[PDB]
Design a protein around this motif. Structure first.
Motif, PDB file in Angstrom:
ATOM      1  N   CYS A 186       0.944  -1.193  -0.026  1.00 18.47           N
ATOM      2  CA  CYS A 186      -0.003  -0.033  -0.005  1.00 18.47           C
ATOM      3  C   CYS A 186       0.913   0.955   0.209  1.00 18.47           C
ATOM      4  O   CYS A 186       0.512   2.248  -0.761  1.00 18.47           O
ATOM      5  N   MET A 187       1.809   1.316   0.802  1.00 16.87           N
ATOM      6  CA  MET A 187       2.943   2.273   1.027  1.00 16.87           C
ATOM      7  C   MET A 187       3.673   2.574  -0.140  1.00 16.87           C
ATOM      8  O   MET A 187       4.411   3.761  -0.436  1.00 16.87           O
ATOM      9  N   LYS A 188       3.793   1.635  -1.101  1.00 19.24           N
ATOM     10  CA  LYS A 188       4.573   1.664  -2.242  1.00 19.24           C
ATOM     11  C   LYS A 188       3.696   2.378  -3.394  1.00 19.24           C
ATOM     12  O   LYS A 188       4.079   3.266  -4.310  1.00 19.24           O
ATOM     13  N   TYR A 189       2.616   1.685  -3.580  1.00 21.01           N
ATOM     14  CA  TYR A 189       1.627   2.010  -4.820  1.00 21.01           C
ATOM     15  C   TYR A 189       0.950   3.357  -4.461  1.00 21.01           C
ATOM     16  O   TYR A 189       0.831   4.298  -5.360  1.00 21.01           O
ATOM     17  N   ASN A 190       0.756   3.707  -3.266  1.00 23.44           N
ATOM     18  CA  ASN A 190      -0.077   4.976  -3.106  1.00 23.44           C
ATOM     19  C   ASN A 190       0.816   5.908  -2.508  1.00 23.44           C
ATOM     20  O   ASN A 190       1.862   5.817  -1.644  1.00 23.44           O
ATOM     21  N   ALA A 191       0.642   7.285  -2.902  1.00 24.38           N
ATOM     22  CA  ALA A 191       1.346   8.234  -2.364  1.00 24.38           C
ATOM     23  C   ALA A 191       1.106   8.876  -0.746  1.00 24.38           C
ATOM     24  O   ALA A 191       0.046   8.313  -0.261  1.00 24.38           O
TER      25      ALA A 191
HETATM   26 NA    NA Z   1       5.166   5.323  -3.821  1.00 15.96          NA
END
Ligand code: NA
Length: 121
Positions: free
Chosen positions: A85-90
């Motif tokens: 989640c922390m990677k895909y979303n800003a």
């Molecule tokens: Na990111």
């Protein structure tokens, strides 16, 4: 053998404990952001980004097959939920922020789960 039976009883009791852990973690997600897999029909590009998708329903399926042999395995899957989640979303999104709050609240639950697993054996 009786020794195999005893190992099976231990896996069963771990499964019980991890079910209560899974319930407690999931209560920390009342929006149900992490309840189900990301759908490739609605984020067609997802698997280009995230190699090992994870969600609470997926964990529950594994748990019900007694598929976690130790707490480390279960924690790995919970960390995937958060980290993906922390990677895909800003940083500025409700999704990222919900993952931070789940990680923080979940730390409490997991800290005592580790003491209980170690203590009971
Ligand atoms: Na990111």
């Amino acid at each position: 053998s009786m020794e195999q039976v005893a190992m099976e009883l231990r896996l069963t009791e771990l499964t019980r404990l991890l079910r209560s852990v899974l319930d407690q973690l999931q209560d920390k997600d009342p929006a149900r952001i992490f309840a189900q897999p990301v759908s490739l029909k609605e984020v067609p590009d997802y698997l280009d980004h995230i190699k090992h998708p994870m969600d609470f329903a997926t964990m529950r399926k594994r748990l019900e097959a007694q598929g976690y042999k130790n707490l480390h395995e279960f924690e790995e899957d919970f960390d995937l939920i958060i980290d993906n989640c922390m990677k895909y979303n800003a940083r500025d999104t409700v999704f990222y922020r919900a993952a931070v709050r789940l990680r923080d609240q979940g730390g409490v639950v997991l800290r005592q789960a580790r003491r209980e697993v170690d203590s009971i054996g």
